[PDB]
Design an enzyme around this catalytic site. Structure first.
Site, PDB file in Angstrom:
ATOM      1  N   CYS A 157       0.966  -1.088   0.060  1.00  0.00           N
ATOM      2  CA  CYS A 157      -0.120   0.019  -0.204  1.00  0.00           C
ATOM      3  C   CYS A 157       0.716   1.316  -0.082  1.00  0.00           C
ATOM      4  O   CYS A 157       0.424   2.407  -0.018  1.00  0.00           O
ATOM      5  CB  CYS A 157      -0.789   0.006   1.151  1.00  0.00           C
ATOM      6  N   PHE A 208     -10.278  -4.017   0.421  1.00  0.00           N
ATOM      7  CA  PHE A 208      -9.670  -4.130  -0.922  1.00  0.00           C
ATOM      8  C   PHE A 208     -10.442  -4.277  -2.134  1.00  0.00           C
ATOM      9  O   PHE A 208     -11.289  -5.022  -2.338  1.00  0.00           O
ATOM     10  CB  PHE A 208      -8.525  -5.108  -0.913  1.00  0.00           C
ATOM     11  N   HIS A 302      -3.186   7.920   1.381  1.00  0.00           N
ATOM     12  CA  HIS A 302      -3.572   6.662   1.144  1.00  0.00           C
ATOM     13  C   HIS A 302      -4.497   6.103   2.274  1.00  0.00           C
ATOM     14  O   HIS A 302      -4.166   5.919   3.280  1.00  0.00           O
ATOM     15  CB  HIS A 302      -2.265   5.424   1.228  1.00  0.00           C
ATOM     16  N   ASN A 335      -9.915   0.272  -1.091  1.00  0.00           N
ATOM     17  CA  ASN A 335      -8.408   0.139  -1.036  1.00  0.00           C
ATOM     18  C   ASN A 335      -8.013  -0.548  -2.213  1.00  0.00           C
ATOM     19  O   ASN A 335      -8.266  -1.659  -2.243  1.00  0.00           O
ATOM     20  CB  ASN A 335      -8.065  -0.256   0.457  1.00  0.00           C
TER      21      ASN A 335
HETATM   22  C1  COA Z   1     -13.031  -1.193   9.453  1.00  0.00           C
HETATM   23  C2  COA Z   1     -12.183  -1.320  10.602  1.00  0.00           C
HETATM   24  C3  COA Z   1     -11.617  -2.079   9.641  1.00  0.00           C
HETATM   25  C4  COA Z   1     -12.865   0.038  10.898  1.00  0.00           C
HETATM   26  O1  COA Z   1     -14.032  -0.527  11.965  1.00  0.00           O
HETATM   27  P1  COA Z   1     -13.755   0.116  13.401  1.00  0.00           P
HETATM   28  O2  COA Z   1     -13.960   1.558  13.358  1.00  0.00           O
HETATM   29  O3  COA Z   1     -12.578  -0.594  13.811  1.00  0.00           O
HETATM   30  O4  COA Z   1     -15.038  -0.655  14.047  1.00  0.00           O
HETATM   31  P2  COA Z   1     -15.063  -1.854  15.033  1.00  0.00           P
HETATM   32  O5  COA Z   1     -13.888  -1.908  16.079  1.00  0.00           O
HETATM   33  O6  COA Z   1     -16.364  -2.264  15.588  1.00  0.00           O
HETATM   34  O7  COA Z   1     -14.487  -3.049  14.176  1.00  0.00           O
HETATM   35  C5  COA Z   1     -15.238  -4.264  13.878  1.00  0.00           C
HETATM   36  C6  COA Z   1     -14.436  -5.587  14.097  1.00  0.00           C
HETATM   37  O8  COA Z   1     -13.268  -5.410  13.286  1.00  0.00           O
HETATM   38  C7  COA Z   1     -12.199  -6.274  13.929  1.00  0.00           C
HETATM   39  N1  COA Z   1     -11.012  -5.434  13.509  1.00  0.00           N
HETATM   40  C8  COA Z   1     -10.634  -4.351  13.486  1.00  0.00           C
HETATM   41  N2  COA Z   1      -9.130  -4.450  12.874  1.00  0.00           N
HETATM   42  C9  COA Z   1      -8.878  -5.786  12.841  1.00  0.00           C
HETATM   43  C10 COA Z   1      -7.585  -6.413  12.522  1.00  0.00           C
HETATM   44  N3  COA Z   1      -6.626  -5.758  12.305  1.00  0.00           N
HETATM   45  N4  COA Z   1      -7.717  -7.740  12.698  1.00  0.00           N
HETATM   46  C11 COA Z   1      -8.767  -8.206  13.033  1.00  0.00           C
HETATM   47  N5  COA Z   1      -9.960  -7.728  13.206  1.00  0.00           N
HETATM   48  C12 COA Z   1     -10.024  -6.402  13.353  1.00  0.00           C
HETATM   49  C13 COA Z   1     -12.639  -5.662  15.384  1.00  0.00           C
HETATM   50  O9  COA Z   1     -11.857  -6.658  16.281  1.00  0.00           O
HETATM   51  C14 COA Z   1     -13.994  -5.886  15.557  1.00  0.00           C
HETATM   52  O10 COA Z   1     -14.493  -7.146  15.956  1.00  0.00           O
HETATM   53  P3  COA Z   1     -15.839  -7.213  16.972  1.00  0.00           P
HETATM   54  O11 COA Z   1     -16.977  -6.297  16.538  1.00  0.00           O
HETATM   55  O12 COA Z   1     -16.102  -8.713  16.785  1.00  0.00           O
HETATM   56  O13 COA Z   1     -15.384  -6.682  18.358  1.00  0.00           O
HETATM   57  C15 COA Z   1     -11.107  -0.378  11.226  1.00  0.00           C
HETATM   58  O14 COA Z   1     -10.375  -1.078  12.347  1.00  0.00           O
HETATM   59  C16 COA Z   1      -9.844  -0.012  10.173  1.00  0.00           C
HETATM   60  O15 COA Z   1     -10.075   0.998   9.251  1.00  0.00           O
HETATM   61  N6  COA Z   1      -8.868  -0.412  10.480  1.00  0.00           N
HETATM   62  C17 COA Z   1      -7.615  -0.101   9.423  1.00  0.00           C
HETATM   63  C18 COA Z   1      -7.410  -1.314   8.537  1.00  0.00           C
HETATM   64  C19 COA Z   1      -6.073  -1.221   8.057  1.00  0.00           C
HETATM   65  O16 COA Z   1      -5.104  -1.287   9.014  1.00  0.00           O
HETATM   66  N7  COA Z   1      -5.709  -1.163   6.807  1.00  0.00           N
HETATM   67  C20 COA Z   1      -4.463  -0.613   6.576  1.00  0.00           C
HETATM   68  C21 COA Z   1      -3.839  -1.682   5.564  1.00  0.00           C
HETATM   69  S1  COA Z   1      -3.272  -3.105   4.969  1.00  0.00           S
HETATM   70  O1  ERD Z   2      -2.205  -9.001   1.035  1.00  0.00           O
HETATM   71  C1  ERD Z   2      -2.191  -7.755   0.005  1.00  0.00           C
HETATM   72  C2  ERD Z   2      -3.099  -7.609  -0.952  1.00  0.00           C
HETATM   73  C3  ERD Z   2      -2.636  -6.682  -1.857  1.00  0.00           C
HETATM   74  C4  ERD Z   2      -3.716  -6.513  -2.840  1.00  0.00           C
HETATM   75  C5  ERD Z   2      -3.625  -6.991  -4.106  1.00  0.00           C
HETATM   76  C6  ERD Z   2      -4.582  -6.773  -5.168  1.00  0.00           C
HETATM   77  C7  ERD Z   2      -5.368  -5.889  -4.890  1.00  0.00           C
HETATM   78  O2  ERD Z   2      -6.627  -5.338  -5.879  1.00  0.00           O
HETATM   79  C8  ERD Z   2      -5.752  -5.046  -3.753  1.00  0.00           C
HETATM   80  O3  ERD Z   2      -6.543  -4.219  -3.465  1.00  0.00           O
HETATM   81  C9  ERD Z   2      -4.727  -5.369  -2.685  1.00  0.00           C
HETATM   82  O4  ERD Z   2      -2.448  -5.223  -1.129  1.00  0.00           O
HETATM   83  C10 ERD Z   2      -1.471  -5.432   0.003  1.00  0.00           C
HETATM   84  C11 ERD Z   2      -1.059  -4.065   0.351  1.00  0.00           C
HETATM   85  C12 ERD Z   2      -0.339  -4.322   1.597  1.00  0.00           C
HETATM   86  O5  ERD Z   2       0.471  -3.311   2.188  1.00  0.00           O
HETATM   87  C13 ERD Z   2      -0.168  -5.352   2.386  1.00  0.00           C
HETATM   88  C14 ERD Z   2      -0.741  -6.661   1.990  1.00  0.00           C
HETATM   89  O6  ERD Z   2      -0.659  -7.626   2.538  1.00  0.00           O
HETATM   90  C15 ERD Z   2      -1.552  -6.576   0.624  1.00  0.00           C
END
Ligand code: COA
Ligand code: ERD
Ligand code: COA
Ligand code: ERD
Lengths: 389, 389
Positions: A157, A208, A302, A335
């Protein structure tokens, strides 16, 4: 005895984007995803996934994988079944193809013949091959056989920042260089059934999506012939502290797997201020105008997930409109890993033109592009907009 | 508001190399390879492999894989067995580790603290991961957390040219930039049992070895403090005509597979003259000194195999000593994919110093570095040596 270098800043001269035609609306995705994966009996896991979708701030995504394709290939709908060879056969073909659609749009906008492209950077997290997706794209476009190519595999990402960081030096150090930059992502490499095993992969299933973006980057745009939209002025890359193993992805026999700690938003949000303050200090040194305030910059961020955006906005005290362009792309596309910031750049310049703002950056002169990914790596690019009419 | 650029040509300031300690002598390899793979009954296949080893012009190679490791992991000795996850677990660890040995040698030679490294390029054909081998190497070395990293995965045998092509722009466009360049290759990703199925993979078993090389590349070496050994002056990349599918490699569930047409030497040898003549015409334009003759250049040539060297030498009419440095590395190490040309660069400068030749390029001022690989891609770098004492 020498290669002449360019003079002006590396500039974005055109942007194109492309997505698979199949649209899945988020309201439909919990049913769809658990249906085609034969997991509706997993009742509490699905309620957990419904809450992730409810919170995702994603309205729709474009996905190469259709119900028909998933029905044809049950090892993709399964969980932890060997399926890499099947995934690769798909994405080694479809990632360059999606990239070719975006590249042709960017070239059409740019308006010069495709043989003026001297360099190519192809970035993807979806599949690997030799020759690579860069070679395949060049073949699909009919680029000159001496195009200088670079394939950036397994980036993730932050890759949208990385391609700009490299393209800047290629354009600035080579007079006449015109760099085609393509990021193309297709989730067929990661898609797998649900499981209380791996609640990380569930997050990926909610956020994603697929897409490709393309840039033409070059220094010294020809006046009244080429058009600059953004300029690259400063780049930085940082590994955030105490982030070991925050975001990991492995290419396994079951395909690409995704591991993601819950404190990613915290790590990002609590470190980003010092990074940006340092970057702005380098761009605007005292010795002289002070750096613009955060609310007077444009923001191309991002959107790893809404929690990252919300906590960054809160910690930096950003006015609630600064991330609007970023949040519009997450809402309409999810994403798309490395391509996402270039979709956001496109949305921002198009908004700016449509609304008759004074610059390609929503009316602001200076701006920030941020990519975050495995490391935890933060890629920072300081950009200048271009005045409009 | 800006990043100052450098002035002088990107220069190689130090070189380090490292190989696994286990040595396998080519005279022993047919017995060894067919023994540990349970294929001695395949009597005519082995005579065919003996002839390839007899002709390889490889005396010895350094290999991470030992008989003990192969005995421990029989899916590697088998043929077409699923084994990628096992291979990745090895090389995701050992490729950065081997690279760290070469990097530490180059830094020690360079003599500046490791925190002056501003950029890193890691190139490998052995395994992929997120975060990548670049991140792992930075962690192993303790480089600054803001080092600007780039990982070049799935490059293959042209990668030694590619890393120089990118490092040139990074060093020249960033004042003070010091680029650590590492190529690291470990054949555990490709090793598989023999089979009349795939006589391509047999060629690989006779020629490919393990190794890593590291460079410090920077512009404007500090006088009497840093030492330049070679300068990068011109770069080119070409896809050779009628070479579609000449050299293909796929990352499969059985690991990395290798496909190689018999006419690779022909394709390379019959096109290389026009490429070099054009490159020299750009470096030495008429408008002025003519280009040096081929025999008055130094030659750093990726030794894909002896047939490539022999046919290039014949078609260009090279005097029989021009490829001696290249052939010494192939003899003592085999084909180490992207790292090989940097081993050859090291051998040439060390020969030149030991024999008190007038330049780091065996006494010649100008020189050529050539990489060949999937595409069929030919990477050309025109180099200047540095005068000695
Ligand atoms: C959408 C989630 C995805 C947003 O929802 P939120 O505001 O966190 O709301 P909640 O905490 O109610 O989330 C619902 C569930 O998501 C789960 N969750 C959130 N992040 C998680 C993670 N990294 N792994 C596993 N579970 C996760 C919570 O445990 C929760 O479970 P529960 O409802 O059974 O307790 C949020 O945590 C987020 O945006 N995270 C960013 C994801 C990320 O890191 N992306 C960057 C890239 S690879
Ligand atoms: O594990 C992945 C998935 C990856 C990805 C592939 C293809 C798509 O169309 C998409 O939205 C995502 O993107 C990632 C980016 C990261 O930073 C970590 C990852 O593990 C992954
Ligand atoms: C070492 C070989 C490897 C050199 O030997 P040589 O001079 O060709 O001698 P020979 O032709 O007797 O080779 C012996 C066998 O190799 C086989 N061989 C050579 N190239 C082959 C290929 N690409 N695929 C399959 N078999 C091949 C020949 O068919 C021959 O088989 P036979 O003895 O049963 O007829 C040579 O062809 C070479 O150097 N090739 C370059 C390999 C290459 O392309 N490397 C670049 C990189 S991926
Ligand atoms: O298939 C490969 C193998 C690869 C390689 C890996 C590790 C090593 O130690 C080594 O010597 C080689 O190198 C390649 C280079 C290519 O150009 C094509 C390939 O298929 C391969």
């Amino acid at each position: 005895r020498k290669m002449e270098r360019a003079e002006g800043p590396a500039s974005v001269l055109a942007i194109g984007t492309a997505v698979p035609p199949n649209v899945v609306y988020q309201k439909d995705y919990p049913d769809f995803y658990f249906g085609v994966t034969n997991s509706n009996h997993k009742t509490e896991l699905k309620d957990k996934f419904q809450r992730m979708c409810d919170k995702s701030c994603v309205s729709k995504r474009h996905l190469y994988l259709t119900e028909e394709i998933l029905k044809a290939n049950p090892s993709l709908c399964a969980y932890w079944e060997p399926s890499l060879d099947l995934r690769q056969d798909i994405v080694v073909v479809e990632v360059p193809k999606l990239g070719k659609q975006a590249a042709s749009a960017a070239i059409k906008e740019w308006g010069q013949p495709k043989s003026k492209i001297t360099h190519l950077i192809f970035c993807t997290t979806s599949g690997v091959d030799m020759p690579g997706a860069d070679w395949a794209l060049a073949k699909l476009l009919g680029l000159r056989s001496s195009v200088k190519r670079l394939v950036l595999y397994m980036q993730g990402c932050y890759g949208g920042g990385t391609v700009l960081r490299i393209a800047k030096d290629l354009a600035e150090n080579n007079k006449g260089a015109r760099v085609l930059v393509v990021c193309s992502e297709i989730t067929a490499i990661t898609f797998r059934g649900p499981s209380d095993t791996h609640l990380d992969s569930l997050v990926g299933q909610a956020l994603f999506g697929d897409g490709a973006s393309a840039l033409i980057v070059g220094s010294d745009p020809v006046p009244a012939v080429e058009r600059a939209w953004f300029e690259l002025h400063w780049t930085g890359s940082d590994i955030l502290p105490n982030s070991d193993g925050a975001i990991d992805g492995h290419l396994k026999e079951v395909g690409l797997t995704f591991h993601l700690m819950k404190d990613v938003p915290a790590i990002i949000s609590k470190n980003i201020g010092g990074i940006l303050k340092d970057a702005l200090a380098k761009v605007f040194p005292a010795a002289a105008p002070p750096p613009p305030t955060y609310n007077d910059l444009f923001w191309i961020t991002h959107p790893g997930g809404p929690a990252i955006l919300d906590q960054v906005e809160d910690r930096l005290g950003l006015r609630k409109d600064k991330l609007a362009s970023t949040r519009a792309v997450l809402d309409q596309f999810g994403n798309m890993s490395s391509a996402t910031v270039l979709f956001i750049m496109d949305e921002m310049r198009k908004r700016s033109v449509e609304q008759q703002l004074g610059t390609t950056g929503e009316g602001h002169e200076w701006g920030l592009l941020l990519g975050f990914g495995p490391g935890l790596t933060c890629e920072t690019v300081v950009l200048r907009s271009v005045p409009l009419v």
